[PDB]
RNA sequence: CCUCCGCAUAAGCCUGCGUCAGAUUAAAACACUGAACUGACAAUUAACAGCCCAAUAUCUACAAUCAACCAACAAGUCAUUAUUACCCUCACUGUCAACCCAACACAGGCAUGCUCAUAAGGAAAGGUUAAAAAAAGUAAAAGGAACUCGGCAAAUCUUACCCC
RNA sequence: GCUAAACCUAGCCCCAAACCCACUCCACCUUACUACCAGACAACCUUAGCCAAACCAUUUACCCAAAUAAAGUAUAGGCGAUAGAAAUUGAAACCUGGCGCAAUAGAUAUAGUACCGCAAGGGAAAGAUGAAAAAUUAUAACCAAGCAUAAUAUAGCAAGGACUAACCCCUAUACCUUCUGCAUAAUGAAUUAACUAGAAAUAACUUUGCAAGGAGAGCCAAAGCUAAGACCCCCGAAACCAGACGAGCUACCUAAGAACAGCUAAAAGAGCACACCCGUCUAUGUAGCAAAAUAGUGGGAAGAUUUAUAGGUAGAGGCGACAAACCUA
């Protein structure tokens, strides 16, 4: 759950909590770290779910969507575009089923595209005076909303069903606390009918 | 395990409940007595010359006649100043080397990018 | 409760009562042979016999007759990569017994592997893999080594 | 040589060391002159377990519960919520006296009642 | 790396920190004064320039002190400006022999005095120079009150000085009623000093004792926040009502 | 006098994408064919225009 | 076949030949798989020895050695009284092992009880031939220390003389 | 081509600036990592020593207040190897790097980890493909010391002259050094890769610049003054002091315990003899089982005997039934 990562750990697509990650770089090799661009959290404009465009590569000028983002090394993948070829099932007597695998790209090679004309355009962070903070274009002045992407919880609230050990909503938001000058221990003692006649004598503290 | 996240969920729920009840107890103590941290104590210097927070153990007999509490010394004595100075110099070297590392990293970032 | 300073009791003071306890018992299945009345638990290092009796008779309300506990010392021989011993966390197992002569066994939480729902992001890949395995494994030793793709 | 990196448990000393070490168990009594233990019933932690019959609250919350902002519960909020209305009520009429404040919950000392806050007489 | 302040300024830094900075100004000045004592074990030079023989050229001469040792018996009793000299002495007063070590010890005479300001007799192992200074100062109280802290070289002397200063400042009844003329004459005899009360309590105290006294004066149990809260509440309601 | 051999790897591709992850695989084909076409038996005999 | 051994107590790191998968590589002086291993499963529950004793004043010279004759000298290993107060009671440490100290799985060393050989426990030999040399064991036609500075392993069983 | 060779980053040293920090709950002075009970005694002290003067007994910068000239001047000094001021003009606040390096270098450090002793303490190598290891692909190979591919073929410090061809023909006594004389049978060496050993003043030499003046205050000068270049090794002992540690093996002492079959028992610091304490001799090995072993021939074995537990006596000393014996091989 909470494992301490090495100070110079290499992020290679696979999450740190996996068998392939422990097989790749086990805690014994301290290879050369890869210095990445020091990008802050407020300037990160591209998210996960919006459409992007590959600048250059084996298939430049093509569109696609992002399914996973990496903030440690600025690695982003495209939904089945700049991909190669490998094999999934591999044994000692038979192997096949060639399934393409995506390749990560950098932020300098990925530009956000506006859905109005489907053209590459640099997007800046212009703080709106209404209250929220969205993304505003530069040469076009257009606004690009945040793409709706499912959270990591793996469950949507539009069809959630309360189980046996799941409470409702009308009881969790019921105002039942009464502010007073009584401790919880004495309150739960006097509420159950527990009484006490003797007191506590004098004691020192040193 | 079928669902290991339920354990962590219950753990964080109980931790939040403990934090809430501790905050309530601290607020009530400040409204009544007005002193933070229900564990009493004072800043005392040990033999090693380290400024630590000594916690009271709550005894029965007082301290002016106890046999085991009187054997617990609380004075620096002029022979630990050199060790404290050496520890300060070591920590200063650590901080200077950390600052040098940060400056080298900044220079590498400005040179490559 | 554990990791909590207990108040010093004076001769004639009030009853020491705890509300929100900080104990976590674990019902572990016995490894060796045990009778039908002896139940094995696992209490933390800061728990005695009367405390376990009160914890079992206050919450679960289980009639406990006798409690016999002992300390278990974890292993300490496993070496890492830099030649260093790995210390395992210790625990204290219990051996409580029922009072009214009742019986208790340890059921299994596992023999129920009858699950086959709709799988699109997991079962589809396995179905494609098994279909490819069934369609590809068709070698012919009479060919010698020529590929079976050219229809000529 | 013997071990040094390992901690001092209760399986290292001879016959004269097994006993006074222990595993940090809380004592509930003392000894006498006949190798006996005098257990006091007022020293064992008594677990107070309330009834759970008519209690309609599950340990897990539903996902349909709306979220809200988080803020610490300081002493000023509790004061302004509890003592402020009573003080305003007794002052708006004409009977407030700054000499006595024991009728609002304030205690000048902690040696009067049982459950003291600063010395903490209760366990947990 | 290097340090910002020298090694002989850390005491001043700690005094200017926080807990040691709340001390009064007169006490800090008396502690940082540091004045050389009077020559005891060596005859000081007359003028700053001395004409040495063999050559008719003037040269500047200086009187250096003698590193003497102060045992706790000196701090307990009332000694003069002497003590233990841990020096070295040659054989037959010649440098072409053997350099031996010799430690001189002062003479101790267990006598008995009588202080007029305190009206109580004390048994002090007095020496000879102290008796000579007492006879020259015309009494013991004058010798205690006139000599500064760098002349007593003892804690009992500073304690007696502080006690006499407090007795002369507070105007507390020394003896007893039914005869105030004696107390009036005693107070009039010692009138050329009269150190105020706020400055006489910090005379002769060490650093640790001064820190302890400052902590005891600045103790103050934490006032409950309920009083401050109700005070702010009543102030706010008065401000919103009177307007 | 206390060294062993490292390099512990396997030559087999197991399952690891869908084991606790939020990124699926965007394929570009399928397994086999949808329905097997059945040519006529007299295809070689009637290889002309029509009949 | 040996038992000049073993079982317990005392001292000692505490999990160190139970199961499962790997046994492709890695430590067995070679193999099976396991006293020179990786991860998971849990052993040992006290009644055994400890964890000890409310004070004020006072009291305790005729040993042990079957202790009954006798006999001593190194003159000795064990005990209570009056008063005050105290009727809550069974908590804690370990119960595994083929194990310790000597760099080791070493022909070295370790305190007491038990049958002084038994109901404890183990194998001098991997196979092939009988080279020379060396070490450990039985005896030999005649002499029994005649070889060696000296009775130097050895078995018979051995008296007298001198110095210290 | 196997063994195996290179792939840069944790950062490492000193400057300028800045003064740098220490409780989330529990445990930490007794057997620290221990919740709970009745003598409160615990610091205030010339450091020494090595070396040098060819020994050494006086002496020998180290002393913690910013530069320099005075000045290494008066002075102190077995008046000698050396040490060394003062009086005096004076001393321009603020700026983020390496004509240093990249794992045998640079802190020892990924670390004060393993390991050694009861103890203080000593204390070492580590990590290399790649944009995509969620690309287990097919390549990039080629160089040192060791090997097969591909053993020897008579003769000779391994070498030279040579011819149509390796030998066959002739000549020829390895390397640095203390030494007159060394391959000598004197010293060192198995190779490869990394590392390791001439650092500097007064007085001298040469070349610019200025000049009876030179020189960025101070110093020199009857052709001088300033600046630059040029120059003087490494490793290897027994000894002494200061601050801390050891009687768990061994010497002695203290308190409570245990051990000794059987026979003759003359009453015994009696005898033979089990277990036990020590080891006079033979044989085996001296990189062995063992940095002190294996059987008997051995002495004692009711006491000047042995042993389990706990404490004390430590170097200008402890102890000693006196071996200069022992004080953790
Ligand atoms: Mg057992
Ligand atoms: Mg050995
Ligand atoms: Mg058997
Ligand atoms: Mg053989
Ligand atoms: Mg014969
Ligand atoms: Mg002969
Ligand atoms: Mg013989
Ligand atoms: Mg010399
Ligand atoms: Mg000057
Ligand atoms: Mg290094
Ligand atoms: Mg190193
Ligand atoms: Mg080669
Ligand atoms: Mg020839
Ligand atoms: Mg050479
Ligand atoms: Mg030589
Ligand atoms: Mg010669
Ligand atoms: Mg030679
Ligand atoms: Mg020679
Ligand atoms: Mg040689
Ligand atoms: Mg001893
Ligand atoms: Mg002896
Ligand atoms: Mg005898
Ligand atoms: Mg005998
Ligand atoms: Mg002799």
From Swiss-Prot, chain A:
GO biological process: mitochondrial translation; translation
Residue ranges of coiled coil: none
Domain spans labelled KOW: 46-79
Cellular localization per UniProt: Mitochondrion
Gene3D superfamilies, A to Z: 2.30.30.30
Keyword terms: Mitochondrion, Phosphoprotein, Ribonucleoprotein, Ribosomal protein, Transit peptide
Main location: mitochondrion
Molecular function in Gene Ontology: RNA binding; structural constituent of ribosome
GO cellular component, one term: mitochondrial large ribosomal subunit
Cystines in this chain: none
Modified residues (Phosphoserine): 14
InterPro entries: KOW (IPR005824), Rib_uL2_dom2 (IPR014722), Ribosomal_uL24 (IPR003256), Ribosomal_uL24_CS (IPR005825), Ribosomal_uL24_KOW (IPR041988), Translation_prot_SH3-like_sf (IPR008991)
Pfam families: KOW, ribosomal_L24
Subunit organization: Component of the mitochondrial large ribosomal subunit (mt-LSU). Mature mammalian 55S mitochondrial ribosomes consist of a small (28S) and a large (39S) subunit. The 28S small subunit contains a 12S ribosomal RNA (12S mt-rRNA) and 30 different proteins. The 39S large subunit contains a 16S rRNA (16S mt-rRNA), a copy of mitochondrial valine transfer RNA (mt-tRNA(Val)), which plays an integral structural role, and 52 different proteins.
NCBIfam families the UniProt entry points to: rplX_bact
Similarity comment: Belongs to the universal ribosomal protein uL24 family.
Protein name per the record: Large ribosomal subunit protein uL24m
Species, as recorded: Homo sapiens
Gene that this polypeptide is encoded by: MRPL24
From Swiss-Prot, chain C:
Annotated keywords: Mitochondrion, Ribonucleoprotein, Ribosomal protein
Coiled coil: none
Region annotation Disordered: where it falls in the sequence: 107-152
Entry keyword Mitochondrion: yes
GO cellular component, one term: fibrillar center
InterPro entries: Nucleotide-bd_a/b_plait_sf, Ribosomal_uL23-like, Ribosomal_uL23/eL15/eS24_sf
GO molecular function: RNA binding; structural constituent of ribosome
Basic and acidic residues bias (residue ranges): 130-143
GO biological process: mitochondrial translation; translation
Assembly with partners or alone: Component of the mitochondrial large ribosomal subunit (mt-LSU). Mature mammalian 55S mitochondrial ribosomes consist of a small (28S) and a large (39S) subunit. The 28S small subunit contains a 12S ribosomal RNA (12S mt-rRNA) and 30 different proteins. The 39S large subunit contains a 16S rRNA (16S mt-rRNA), a copy of mitochondrial valine transfer RNA (mt-tRNA(Val)), which plays an integral structural role, and 52 different proteins.
Protein name: Large ribosomal subunit protein uL23m
Gene name as annotated: MRPL23
UniProtKB/Swiss-Prot annotation, chain E:
GO terms for MF: RNA binding; structural constituent of ribosome
Domain of life: Eukaryota
Any one of the GO BP annotations: translation
Keyword Ribosomal protein attributed: yes
Pfam family, one: Ribosomal_L28
Transit peptide: 1-54
Subcellular location: Mitochondrion
GO CC, any one term: cytosol
InterPro entries (UniProt xref): Ribosomal_bL28 (IPR026569), Ribosomal_bL28/bL31-like_sf (IPR034704), Ribosomal_bL28_sf (IPR037147)
Tissue expression notes: Found in a variety of normal tissues including spleen, testes, thymus, liver, kidney, brain, adrenal, lung and retinal tissue.
Chief site of localization: mitochondrion
Keywords: Mitochondrion, Ribonucleoprotein, Ribosomal protein, Transit peptide
Family named by the database record: Belongs to the bacterial ribosomal protein bL28 family.
Protein's UniProt name: Large ribosomal subunit protein bL28m
Organism: Homo sapiens
Curated annotation (Swiss-Prot), chain F:
Summary of the function given for this chain in its UniProt record: Component of the mitochondrial large ribosomal subunit (mt-LSU). Within the mitochondrial ribosomes, required to direct the nascent polypeptide toward the tunnel exit and position the exit at a distance from the membrane surface.
Compartments (UniProt record): Mitochondrion
Protein name (database record): Large ribosomal subunit protein mL45
Gene responsible for this protein: MRPL45
Family statement: Belongs to the mitochondrion-specific ribosomal protein mL45 family.
Whole-protein coverage range: 52 to 102 of 306
Signal peptide: none
Lineage: Eukaryota, Metazoa, Chordata, Craniata, Vertebrata
Quaternary state and interactors: Component of the mitochondrial large ribosomal subunit (mt-LSU). Mature mammalian 55S mitochondrial ribosomes consist of a small (28S) and a large (39S) subunit. The 28S small subunit contains a 12S ribosomal RNA (12S mt-rRNA) and 30 different proteins. The 39S large subunit contains a 16S rRNA (16S mt-rRNA), a copy of mitochondrial valine transfer RNA (mt-tRNA(Val)), which plays an integral structural role, and 52 different proteins.
Recorded superkingdom: Eukaryota
Source organism of this protein record: Homo sapiens (Human)
């Amino acid at each position: 759950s909470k494992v301490t990562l090495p100070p110079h750990y290499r992020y290679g697509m696979s999450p740190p909590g996996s068998v392939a990650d422990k097989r790749k770089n086990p805690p014994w090799i301290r290879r050369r770290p890869v210095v990445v661009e020091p990008i802050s959290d407020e300037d990160w404009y591209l998210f996960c779910g919006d459409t992007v465009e590959i600048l250059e590569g084996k298939d430049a000028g093509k569109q696609g969507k992002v399914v996973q983002v990496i903030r440690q090394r600025n690695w982003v993948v495209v939904g089945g575009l700049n991909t190669h070829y490998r094999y999934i099932g591999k044994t000692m007597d038979y192997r096949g089923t060639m399934i393409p695998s995506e390749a990560p790209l950098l932020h300098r090679q990925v530009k956000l595209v506006d859905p109005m004309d489907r053209k590459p355009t640099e997007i800046e962070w212009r703080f709106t005076e209404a209250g929220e903070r969205v993304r505003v274009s530069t040469r076009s002045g257009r606004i690009i909303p945040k793409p709706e992407f499912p959270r990591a919880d793996g469950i949507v609230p539009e069809t959630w069903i309360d189980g046996p050990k799941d409470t409702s909503v009308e009881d969790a938001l019921e105002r039942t606390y009464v502010p007073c000058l009584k401790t919880l221990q004495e309150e739960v003692m006097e509420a159950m009918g527990i009484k006490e006649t003797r007191k506590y004598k004098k004691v020192y503290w040193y | 395990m079928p669902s290991p996240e339920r354990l962590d969920k219950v753990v964080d729920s109980m931790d939040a409940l403990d934090k809430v009840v501790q905050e309530r107890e601290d607020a009530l103590r400040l409204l009544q007595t007005g002193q933070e941290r229900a564990r009493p104590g004072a800043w005392r210097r040990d033999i090693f010359g380290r400024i630590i927070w000594h916690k009271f153990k709550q005894w029965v007999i007082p301290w002016h006649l106890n046999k085991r509490y009187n054997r617990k010394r609380f004075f620096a004595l002029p022979y630990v100043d050199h060790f404290l100075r050496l520890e300060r110099e070591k920590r200063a070297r650590i901080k200077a080397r950390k600052e040098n590392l940060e400056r080298k990293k900044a220079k590498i970032l400005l040179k490559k990018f | 409760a554990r990791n909590v300073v207990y108040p010093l009791y004076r001769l004639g003071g009030p009853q020491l009562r705890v509300f929100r306890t900080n104990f976590f018992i674990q019902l572990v299945r016995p490894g060796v042979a045990q009778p039908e009345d002896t139940v094995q638990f696992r209490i933390p290092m800061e728990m005695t016999r009367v405390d376990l009796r009160n914890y079992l008779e206050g919450i679960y309300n289980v009639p406990v007759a006798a409690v016999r506990t002992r300390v278990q010392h974890g292993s300490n021989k496993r070496r890492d990569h830099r030649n260093v011993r790995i210390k395992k966390p210790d625990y204290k197992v219990a051996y409580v017994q029922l009072a009214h002569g009742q019986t208790f066994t340890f059921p299994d939480l596992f023999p129920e592997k009858d699950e086959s729902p709709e799988g699109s992001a997991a079962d589809d890949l396995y179905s494609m893999l098994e279909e490819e395995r069934q369609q590809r494994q068709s070698s012919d030793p009479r060919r010698g080594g020529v590929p079976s793709w050219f229809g000529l | 040589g013997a071990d040094r990196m390992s901690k001092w448990t209760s399986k290292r000393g001879p016959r004269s060391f097994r006993g006074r070490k222990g595993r940090g168990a809380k004592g509930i009594g003392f000894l006498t002159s006949g190798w006996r233990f005098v257990q006091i019933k007022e020293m064992v932690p008594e677990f107070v377990v309330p009834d759970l019959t008519g209690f309609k609250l599950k340990p897990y919350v539903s996902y349909l519960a709306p979220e809200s902002e988080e803020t610490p519960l300081t002493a000023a909020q509790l004061f302004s919520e509890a003592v402020a209305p009573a003080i305003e009520k007794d002052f708006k009429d004409g009977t407030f006296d700054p000499d006595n404040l024991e009728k609002y919950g304030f205690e000048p000392t902690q040696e009067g009642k049982l459950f003291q806050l600063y010395p903490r007489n209760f366990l947990r | 790396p290097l340090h910002k302040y020298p090694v002989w300024l850390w005491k001043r830094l700690q005094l200017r920190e926080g807990i040691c900075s709340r001390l009064p100004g007169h006490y800090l000045r008396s502690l940082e004064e540091e004045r050389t004592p009077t020559p005891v074990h060596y005859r000081p030079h007359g003028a700053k320039f001395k004409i040495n023989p063999k050559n008719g050229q003037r040269e500047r001469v200086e009187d250096v002190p003698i590193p003497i040792y102060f045992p706790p018996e000196s701090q307990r009793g009332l000694w003069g400006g002497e003590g233990w000299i841990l020096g070295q002495i040659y054989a037959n007063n010649d440098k072409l022999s053997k350099r031996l070590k010799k430690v001189w010890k002062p003479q101790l005479f267990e006598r008995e005095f009588y202080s007029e300001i305190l009206d109580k007799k004390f048994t002090v192992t007095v020496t000879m120079r102290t008796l000579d200074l007492i006879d020259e100062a015309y009494g013991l109280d004058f010798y205690i009150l006139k000599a500064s802290g760098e002349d007593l070289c003892s804690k009992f002397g500073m304690d007696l000085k502080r006690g006499m200063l407090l007795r002369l400042a507070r105007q507390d009844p020394q003896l007893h009623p039914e005869d105030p003329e004696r107390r009036a004459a005693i107070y009039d005899k010692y009138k050329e000093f009269a150190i105020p009360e706020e400055e006489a309590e910090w005379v002769g105290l060490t650093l640790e004792e001064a820190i302890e006294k400052q902590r005891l004066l600045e103790e103050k149990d934490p006032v409950p926040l309920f009083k401050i809260y109700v005070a702010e509440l009543i102030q706010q309601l008065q401000q919103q009502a009177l307007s | 006098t206390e060294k062993e051999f490292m390099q512990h790897a396997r030559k087999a591709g197991l399952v690891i994408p869908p084991e606790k992850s939020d990124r699926s695989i965007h394929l570009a084909c399928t397994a086999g064919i949808f329905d097997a076409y059945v040519p006529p038996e007299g295809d070689a005999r009637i290889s002309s225009l029509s009949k």
